[PDB]
Amino acid sequence: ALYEDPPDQKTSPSGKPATLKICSWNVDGLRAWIKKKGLDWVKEEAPDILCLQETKCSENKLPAELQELPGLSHQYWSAPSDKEGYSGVGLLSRQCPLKVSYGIGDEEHDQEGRVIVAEFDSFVLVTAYVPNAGRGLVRLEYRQRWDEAFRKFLKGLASRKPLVLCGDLNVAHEEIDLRNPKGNKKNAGFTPQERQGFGELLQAVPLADSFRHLYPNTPYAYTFWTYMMNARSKNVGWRLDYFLLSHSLLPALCDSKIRSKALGSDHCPITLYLAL
Ligand SMILES: [Mg+2]
């Protein structure tokens, strides 16, 4: 019932050394996260680009520590206009992007600050916080609508450059991605409608589940554990955080990580190495 994240593999399949280290983490709140010393572990990872989801904090109410991160001086936030402590995503980068835009260009789905998109010389990075279908699946329909707006949106960006999607995509693709498949098929995150919406995304915007791509058979690898009953302690989790990317980027895929032990949230960070 235990999992050990293999060592960082920092070379491409052609022996090309990694040049980019992208780190994605669902902070469950910037302030609750800072307090748990998550901004600590980040300094150690020293990524090139750091995507954060569920910042629970507008861009104007940013903590002083953040702007004062060591290398990530090109920050970009996206929070719900008249809300707080709800959703929110950020994309800090050591290098300044070519262009940055927010949302997926579809009025109904750009109301909750969930997507940030940054274009870089060789590719376009897109961080996201897919909307949870909530308890009682009361937002399942909206989710099914979002899934499509996003899938379609992604395919367009894809037709311009190779694509990379870092983020909490609220869904455990296969039974191996969650500790309790047999009993969550009716709960947000593992419903047919969602699971088979993730698959159809990988299949339509030529996208690969970087982790499962490299580690087709590793189980118990999760990125989320409910604070309820120390689920993390017993490793009863869900792999909801991903790094999906264009098939034309596999040649540059070095490794895709799952920082199982970094604390600071109810999600463990996940890192990605690419040789560009
Ligand atoms: Mg949360």
Swiss-Prot record:
E.C. designation(s): 3.1.11.2, 3.1.21.-
Protein name per UniProt: DNA repair nuclease/redox regulator APEX1
Catalytic activity: a deoxyribonucleotide-2'-deoxyribose-5'-monophosphate-DNA + H2O = a 5'-end 2'-deoxyribose-5'-monophosphate-DNA + a 3'-end 2'-deoxyribonucleotide-DNA + H(+); Exonucleolytic cleavage in the 3'- to 5'-direction to yield nucleoside 5'-phosphates; a 3'-end 2'-deoxyribonucleotide-3'-phosphoglycolate-DNA + H2O = 2-phosphoglycolate + a 3'-end 2'-deoxyribonucleotide-DNA + H(+); a 3'-end 2'-deoxyribonucleotide-8-oxoguanine-DNA + H2O = 8-oxo-dGMP + a 3'-end 2'-deoxyribonucleotide-DNA + H(+)
Record-marked site positions (Important for catalytic activity): D241
Family (UniProt): Belongs to the DNA repair enzymes AP/ExoA family.
Protein source organism: Homo sapiens
Binding site for Mg(2+) 2: D168, N170, H267
Modified residues (Phosphothreonine): T191
Known role: Multifunctional protein that plays a central role in the cellular response to oxidative stress. The two major activities of APEX1 are DNA repair and redox regulation of transcriptional factors. Functions as an apurinic/apyrimidinic (AP) endodeoxyribonuclease in the base excision repair (BER) pathway of DNA lesions induced by oxidative and alkylating agents. Initiates repair of AP sites in DNA by catalyzing hydrolytic incision of the phosphodiester backbone immediately adjacent to the damage, generating a single-strand break with 5'-deoxyribose phosphate and 3'-hydroxyl ends.
Phenotype for N170A: Abolishes AP endodeoxyribonuclease activity
Keyword Ligase: no
Site (Interaction with DNA substrate): H267
Residues binding Mg(2+) 1, per UniProt: N26, E54, D266
Entry text on domains: The N-terminus contains the redox activity while the C-terminus exerts the DNA AP-endodeoxyribonuclease activity; both functions are independent in their actions. An unconventional mitochondrial targeting sequence (MTS) is harbored within the C-terminus, that appears to be masked by the N-terminal sequence containing the nuclear localization signal (NLS), that probably blocks the interaction between the MTS and Tom proteins.
Keywords: Acetylation, Activator, Cleavage on pair of basic residues, Cytoplasm, Disulfide bond, DNA damage, DNA recombination, DNA repair, DNA-binding, Endonuclease, Endoplasmic reticulum, Exonuclease, Hydrolase, Magnesium, Metal-binding, Mitochondrion, Nuclease, Nucleus, Phosphoprotein, Repressor, RNA-binding, S-nitrosylation, Transcription, Transcription regulation, Ubl conjugation
GO molecular function, one term: DNA endonuclease activity
UniProt short sequence motif Nuclear export signal (NES), positions renumbered to this chain: 22-38
InterPro entries: AP_endonuc_1, AP_endonuclease_F1_BS, AP_endonuclease_F1_CS, Endo/exonu/phosph_ase_sf, Endo/exonuclease/phosphatase
Subunit relationships: Monomer. Homodimer; disulfide-linked. Component of the SET complex, composed of at least APEX1, SET, ANP32A, HMGB2, NME1 and TREX1. Associates with the dimer XRCC5/XRCC6 in a DNA-dependent manner. Interacts with SIRT1; the interaction is increased in the context of genotoxic stress. Interacts with HDAC1, HDAC2 and HDAC3; the interactions are not dependent on the APEX1 acetylation status. Interacts with XRCC1; the interaction is induced by SIRT1 and increased with the APEX1 acetylated form.
Broad class of the protein's primary localization: nucleus
Effect ascribed to mutating D266A: Reduces AP endodeoxyribonuclease activity. Nearly abolishes AP endodeoxyribonuclease activity
